[PDB]
Design a protein around this motif. Structure first.
Motif, PDB file in Angstrom:
ATOM      1  N   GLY A  99       0.808  -1.206   0.000  1.00 31.51           N
ATOM      2  CA  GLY A  99       0.000   0.000   0.000  1.00 31.51           C
ATOM      3  C   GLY A  99       0.842   1.257   0.000  1.00 31.51           C
ATOM      4  O   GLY A  99       0.334   2.367  -0.161  1.00 31.51           O
ATOM      5  N   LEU A 100       2.143   1.068   0.174  1.00 33.19           N
ATOM      6  CA  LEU A 100       3.098   2.166   0.209  1.00 33.19           C
ATOM      7  C   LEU A 100       3.352   2.717  -1.196  1.00 33.19           C
ATOM      8  O   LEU A 100       3.418   1.965  -2.169  1.00 33.19           O
ATOM      9  CB  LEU A 100       4.407   1.661   0.813  1.00 33.19           C
ATOM     10  N   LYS A 101       3.489   4.034  -1.301  1.00 36.98           N
ATOM     11  CA  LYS A 101       3.879   4.666  -2.557  1.00 36.98           C
ATOM     12  C   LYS A 101       5.400   4.677  -2.627  1.00 36.98           C
ATOM     13  O   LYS A 101       6.065   4.533  -1.605  1.00 36.98           O
ATOM     14  CB  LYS A 101       3.336   6.097  -2.625  1.00 36.98           C
ATOM     15  N   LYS A 102       5.953   4.835  -3.826  1.00 33.56           N
ATOM     16  CA  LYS A 102       7.401   4.746  -4.016  1.00 33.56           C
ATOM     17  C   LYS A 102       8.126   6.047  -3.677  1.00 33.56           C
ATOM     18  O   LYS A 102       7.620   7.133  -3.946  1.00 33.56           O
ATOM     19  CB  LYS A 102       7.709   4.363  -5.458  1.00 33.56           C
ATOM     20  N   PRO A 226      18.747  -1.375   1.207  1.00 34.30           N
ATOM     21  CA  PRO A 226      17.349  -1.560   1.599  1.00 34.30           C
ATOM     22  C   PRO A 226      17.145  -1.332   3.094  1.00 34.30           C
ATOM     23  O   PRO A 226      18.090  -1.432   3.873  1.00 34.30           O
ATOM     24  CB  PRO A 226      17.064  -3.000   1.205  1.00 34.30           C
ATOM     25  N   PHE A 227      15.911  -1.029   3.493  1.00 34.32           N
ATOM     26  CA  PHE A 227      15.580  -0.877   4.908  1.00 34.32           C
ATOM     27  C   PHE A 227      14.787  -2.078   5.413  1.00 34.32           C
ATOM     28  O   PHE A 227      13.835  -2.520   4.770  1.00 34.32           O
ATOM     29  CB  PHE A 227      14.780   0.412   5.132  1.00 34.32           C
ATOM     30  N   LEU A 228      15.193  -2.609   6.561  1.00 34.34           N
ATOM     31  CA  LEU A 228      14.421  -3.640   7.231  1.00 34.34           C
ATOM     32  C   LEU A 228      13.350  -2.981   8.075  1.00 34.34           C
ATOM     33  O   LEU A 228      13.640  -2.071   8.848  1.00 34.34           O
ATOM     34  CB  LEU A 228      15.318  -4.492   8.127  1.00 34.34           C
ATOM     35  N   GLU A 233      11.585  -6.042   3.795  1.00 35.88           N
ATOM     36  CA  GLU A 233      12.788  -5.409   3.302  1.00 35.88           C
ATOM     37  C   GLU A 233      12.393  -4.362   2.279  1.00 35.88           C
ATOM     38  O   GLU A 233      11.876  -4.696   1.223  1.00 35.88           O
ATOM     39  CB  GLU A 233      13.675  -6.466   2.666  1.00 35.88           C
ATOM     40  N   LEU A 234      12.626  -3.095   2.591  1.00 33.13           N
ATOM     41  CA  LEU A 234      12.081  -2.026   1.765  1.00 33.13           C
ATOM     42  C   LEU A 234      13.116  -1.352   0.881  1.00 33.13           C
ATOM     43  O   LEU A 234      14.158  -0.890   1.358  1.00 33.13           O
ATOM     44  CB  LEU A 234      11.415  -0.974   2.640  1.00 33.13           C
ATOM     45  N   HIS A 235      12.813  -1.292  -0.412  1.00 35.48           N
ATOM     46  CA  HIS A 235      13.673  -0.623  -1.372  1.00 35.48           C
ATOM     47  C   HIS A 235      12.909   0.551  -1.947  1.00 35.48           C
ATOM     48  O   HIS A 235      11.694   0.653  -1.782  1.00 35.48           O
ATOM     49  CB  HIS A 235      14.070  -1.584  -2.492  1.00 35.48           C
ATOM     50  N   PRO A 236      13.617   1.461  -2.628  1.00 40.56           N
ATOM     51  CA  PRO A 236      13.014   2.705  -3.115  1.00 40.56           C
ATOM     52  C   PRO A 236      11.758   2.492  -3.954  1.00 40.56           C
ATOM     53  O   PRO A 236      10.809   3.282  -3.870  1.00 40.56           O
ATOM     54  CB  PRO A 236      14.144   3.358  -3.915  1.00 40.56           C
TER      55      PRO A 236
ATOM     56  N   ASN B 130      -3.454   2.472   7.398  1.00 40.99           N
ATOM     57  CA  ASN B 130      -2.935   2.773   8.733  1.00 40.99           C
ATOM     58  C   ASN B 130      -1.675   3.628   8.714  1.00 40.99           C
ATOM     59  O   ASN B 130      -0.797   3.428   9.542  1.00 40.99           O
ATOM     60  CB  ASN B 130      -2.579   1.495   9.495  1.00 40.99           C
ATOM     61  N   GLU B 131      -1.567   4.567   7.785  1.00 41.30           N
ATOM     62  CA  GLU B 131      -0.320   5.305   7.646  1.00 41.30           C
ATOM     63  C   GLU B 131      -0.187   6.502   8.593  1.00 41.30           C
ATOM     64  O   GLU B 131       0.920   6.926   8.936  1.00 41.30           O
ATOM     65  CB  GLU B 131      -0.147   5.733   6.190  1.00 41.30           C
ATOM     66  N   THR B 132      -1.325   7.039   9.018  1.00 47.04           N
ATOM     67  CA  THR B 132      -1.354   8.090  10.021  1.00 47.04           C
ATOM     68  C   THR B 132      -2.392   7.748  11.080  1.00 47.04           C
ATOM     69  O   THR B 132      -3.306   6.967  10.837  1.00 47.04           O
ATOM     70  CB  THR B 132      -1.706   9.448   9.380  1.00 47.04           C
TER      71      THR B 132
END
Ligand SMILES: Cc1cc(C#N)cc(C)c1Oc1nc(Nc2ccc(C#N)cc2)nc(N)c1Br
Ligand SMILES: [Cl-]
Lengths: 552, 401
Positions: A99-102, A226-228, A233-236, B130-132
């Protein structure tokens, strides 16, 4: 180091009053550690000394740090917490990567001494009074109360997040294109800016935070992609689960298999078609955690199938708000469904599975619908909109079932996709009674204390038969009588029963069941060319029914 | 001035989980809620308020309206809106030729809410993924949807309506939640004229559809009439009568399951007999009328069951004790849950007019399915209570129209 933010009003549960717990004696090295800790804390404002005026008290003690040679102050708020009001729950849940944007660049800022940096409500401070014991408790102790949120108090997590959210608000409202996620002590910050202009945006945030009491380590030690994060494991511009190692073992404990399942279940968020059916069937039963469970063949091949899937890395993709979500579902081992969700075929934002029996008896069309429903709720949570579906079922199959079934239902916009095994109906019951088909009047019936049962039938062609079933229920007999009539009749047949229960089961057109009998009855229903099932009132003297009713 | 509001003793406020909302509704909700708070109807709240009630958005008509589910709070204030004061229900509302329903919920935004009660009206606007953290408000004024608001505004409402009541003695005006029910036996044009007249009184105190309840008749359990009769048809017939027997005193099936003798083929056609044909007619007489022996009991919950009949037809019964049908009805005419939702609203509305309370519904649908979708079609300002159940396949059949 102590935020100028306004405090949250706190108070104790309505009846109750502050704790008045007795301080026990501590060893002398422990009293020494407490005094120096608290002297450091007092000079920083975190606590301050109080007179014996204050009625309340709470136990303190100290422990040695990490095999190292430091001590940490521990305070036991058991009783204060038990007496403290309830707060709003912190997080309803945590974001999913899908659900995260880049973002081009990301930085994690860690808030130092988070709790001790937030003031505690002036009126509530007294209830946090603790006493440092004198040696052998001979003389009165050193007494303190908190001025900030104590570690271990009930309200600290909730009051800290709210505090951080008030402080965060302006910066957010002024930098809508830059994104911040707060969790406990940490701040995760993302921008599409370029490493130079972003790091400058960081400094404005850091200096905004500092203007409000909150310190953060600096630009010299900040880690890299990357970020844990939360097991991910999160990449750009891509994401995946944290590296998952499946052990090589000849002997598996109940415990090993549990861990193994959890990791597979976790991997299934992004690794397509992970199956745990066969490994999970191993857990069934009662066994110690230390005990060894011989894997079966199916289970041994599953583990194999899974270990292949995990071989090559797969990543997920982030969410573009301007495109629809498509969701695709497949059938697998009976009761197992897998699904992928993408925006560009076939770069998945994420994947998953569904495997749940609702009731004892379902068919594929019911299961698929439940999976559509589960996937829809998930999309709304993660993306805030519902997906366009692709489903292994003909529009005509679904349409026949919807009307046939007495339950209401509805799935969003969807289309057919030809991905075997296709879901279908395996038989249909007749709407009207059949001409020239034998009519079986059936009936089963047990004895409530004996558990002895007699199932059987009478026919309009004068045929009739009764059997004796042992240790079964009145439920099972009415069902065995249906089975009896299916076995002994031809490809067409009308069956008349008194069991509303049995009627309920079959009328819903099961194609799976926990029951052996029901799966037997199903096998027959498939092989038949016409079955009409009808119900009649028990012992209301109905022609056909009374005959097979006396005869049992 | 705020009328002090006490919860039922021994109960705490509501702590209900906010359902996930679509991006479109969340956004409508912030708009709405920032405007409400400038105006000071609601205030932002701290973590020290542990309570929550669910919020969502509907279309009242392209414009979002906000809907708070106080079903739980209502249960916990109950004593208050039900038995301290508490609005009495006109017995003749259901007898009028025409009754119009008007939304006067806007009126409550005028009256202050007892400060020591505000904290129980807390609600949360969730954020996507659930981002904020959810944004959190309580009410400062009588909220729409809480059964306390009409109880407290009551006093002001009879004042607002007295001249109009004084001038039309024979018009009935019943308040329930956020709606005013206005009925008369005027011809429809003269009724509509009195409504507009009434709108003008309301208009001087703050303020911005048509039922004909005297044409509500029961849906009988119906007995087919047939050219010819099969064993199968007669068994169905003996079933249905046997059910109606557990409800309607007088029903006799003796002469009928007479015809059903021995062990006949389902498709065999069996002759009509006099005393049977008479038993069938005499049974029809009974099913036509009200259930002898069933009365509304003001102290018991109302139950409403619905059965999916197929082809856009839904049947329903309202009872307090099972099978003792207080009323029975149908609803007719796309989308299974859209229809269910319309049906629930229709049934609720009739229930409000007849007994002055909402029934608890037994809904023939998957919990999760209904929970997902119902807000897509809801248009009432109240929400009834409901469970989910699987229709016993026979019950569906016996109430078939
Ligand atoms: C900035 C950030 C970092 C980490 C961490 N760790 C975890 C979270 C939950 C974050 O917040 C958000 N991140 C992203 N995308 C994103 C993109 C790339 C990377 C990388 N690499 C991390 C996050 N989108 C949001 N809407 C939010 Br809110
Ligand atoms: Cl009555």
């Amino acid at each position: 180091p102590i935020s100028p933010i306004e405090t949250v009003p706190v108070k104790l549960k309505p009846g109750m009053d502050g704790p008045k717990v007795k301080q026990w004696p501590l060893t002398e090295e422990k009293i020494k550690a407490l005094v120096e800790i608290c002297t450091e804390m007092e000079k920083e404002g975190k606590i301050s000394k109080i007179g014996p005026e204050n009625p309340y008290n709470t136990p303190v003690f100290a422990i040695k740090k990490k095999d190292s040679t430091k001590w940490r102050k521990l305070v036991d708020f058991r009783e204060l917490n038990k007496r403290t009001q309830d707060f709003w729950e912190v997080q309803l849940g945590i974001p999913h990567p899908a659900g995260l944007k880049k973002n081009k660049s990301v930085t994690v800022l860690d808030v130092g001494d988070a709790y001790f940096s937030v003031p505690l409500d002036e009126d509530f401070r007294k209830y946090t009074a603790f006493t440092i014991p004198s040696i052998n408790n001979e003389t009165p102790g050193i007494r303190y109360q908190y001025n900030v949120l104590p570690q271990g108090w009930k309200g600290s997590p909730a009051i800290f997040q709210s505090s951080m959210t008030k402080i965060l608000e302006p910066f957010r409202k002024q930098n809508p294109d830059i994104v911040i996620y707060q969790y406990m002590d940490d701040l995760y910050v993302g921008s599409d800016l370029e490493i130079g202009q972003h790091r400058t945006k960081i400094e404005e945030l850091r200096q905004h935070l500092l203007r409000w009491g909150l310190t953060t380590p600096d630009k010299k030690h900040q880690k890299e992609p990357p970020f844990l994060w939360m097991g991910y494991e999160l990449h750009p511009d891509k994401w995946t689960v944290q590296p998952i190692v499946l052990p090589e073992k000849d002997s598996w404990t109940v415990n090993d298999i549990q861990k193994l399942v959890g990791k597979l279940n976790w991997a299934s968020q992004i690794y397509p078609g992970i199956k745990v059916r066969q490994l999970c069937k191993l857990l069934r039963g009662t066994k110690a955690l230390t005990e060894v469970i011989p894997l079966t063949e199916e289970a041994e091949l599953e583990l194999a199938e899974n270990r292949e899937i995990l071989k090559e890395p797969v990543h997920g993709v982030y969410y573009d708000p301007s495109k629809d979500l498509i969701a695709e579902i497949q059938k697998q081992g009976q009761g197992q469904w897998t699904y992928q969700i993408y925006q560009e075929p076939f770069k998945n934002l994420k994947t998953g599975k569904y495997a749940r029996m609702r009731g004892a008896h379902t068919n594929d069309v019911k299961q698929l619908t439940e999976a559509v429903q589960k996937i829809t709720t998930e999309s709304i949570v993660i993306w805030g909109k519902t997906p366009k579906f692709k489903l292994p079922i003909q529009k005509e199959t679904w349409e026949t079932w919807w009307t046939e079934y007495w339950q209401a239902t509805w799935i969003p916009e969807w289309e057919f996709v030809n991905t075997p095994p296709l879901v279908k109906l395996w038989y249909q019951l007749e709407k009207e009674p059949i001409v020239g088909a034998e009519t079986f009047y059936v009936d089963g019936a047990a004895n409530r204390e004996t558990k002895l049962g007699k199932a059987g039938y009478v026919t309009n062609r004068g045929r009739q038969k009764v059997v004796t079933l042992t240790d079964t229920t009145n439920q099972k007999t009415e069902l065995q009588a249906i089975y009896l009539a299916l076995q002994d009749s031809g490809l067409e047949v009308n069956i008349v029963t008194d069991s509303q229960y049995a009627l309920g089961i079959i009328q819903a057109q099961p194609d799976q069941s926990e029951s052996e009998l029901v799966n037997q009855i199903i096998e027959q229903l498939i092989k038949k060319e016409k079955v009409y099932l009808a119900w009649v009132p028990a012992h209301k003297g109905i022609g056909g029914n009374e005959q097979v009713d006396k005869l049992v | 001035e705020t009328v002090p509001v006490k919860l039922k003793p021994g109960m705490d406020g509501p702590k209900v989980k906010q359902w996930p909302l679509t991006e479109e509704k969340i956004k409508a909700l912030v708009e709405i809620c920032t405007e409400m708070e400038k105006e000071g109807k609601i205030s932002k709240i701290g973590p020290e308020n542990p309570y929550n009630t669910p919020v969502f958005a509907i279309k009242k008509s392209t414009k979002w309206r906000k809907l708070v589910d106080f079903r739980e709070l209502n249960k916990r204030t109950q004593d208050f809106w039900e038995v301290q004061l508490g609005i009495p229900h006109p017995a003749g509302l259901k007898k009028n030729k025409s009754v119009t329903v008007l939304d006067v919920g806007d009126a409550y935004f005028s009256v202050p809410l007892d400060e020591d009660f505000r904290k129980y009206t807390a609600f949360t606007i969730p954020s996507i993924n659930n981002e904020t953290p959810g944004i959190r408000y309580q009410y400062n004024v009588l909220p729409q949807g809480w059964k306390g608001s009409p109880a407290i505004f009551q006093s002001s409402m009879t004042k607002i309506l007295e001249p109009f009541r004084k001038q039309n003695p024979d018009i009935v005006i019943y308040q329930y939640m956020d709606d005013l029910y206005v009925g008369s036996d005027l011809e429809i044009g003269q009724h509509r004229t009195k409504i507009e007249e009434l709108r003008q009184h309301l208009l001087r105190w703050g303020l911005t559809y048509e039922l004909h309840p005297d044409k509500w008749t029961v849906q009988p359990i119906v007995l087919p009439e047939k050219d010819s009769w099969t064993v199968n048809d007669i068994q169905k017939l003996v079933g249905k009568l046997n059910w109606a027997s557990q409800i309607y005193p007088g029903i006799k099936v003796r002469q009928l399951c007479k015809l059903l003798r021995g062990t006949k083929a389902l498709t065999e056609v069996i002759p009509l007999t006099e005393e049977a044909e008479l038993e069938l007619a005499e049974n029809r007489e009974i099913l036509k009328e009200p259930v002898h022996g069933v009365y509304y009991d003001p102290s018991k919950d109302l139950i409403a069951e619905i059965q999916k009949q197929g082809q856009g037809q839904w049947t329903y019964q309202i009872y307090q004790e099972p099978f003792k049908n207080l009323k029975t009805g149908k609803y007719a005419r796309t989308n299974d849950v859209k229809q269910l939702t319309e049906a629930v609203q229709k049934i609720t509305t009739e229930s409000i007019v007849i007994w002055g309370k909402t029934p608890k519904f037994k809904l023939p649908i998957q919990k999760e399915t209904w929970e997902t979708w119902w807000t897509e079609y809801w248009q009432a300002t109240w929400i009834p209570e409901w469970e989910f159940v699987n229709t016993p396949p026979l019950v569906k059949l016996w109430y078939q129209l």
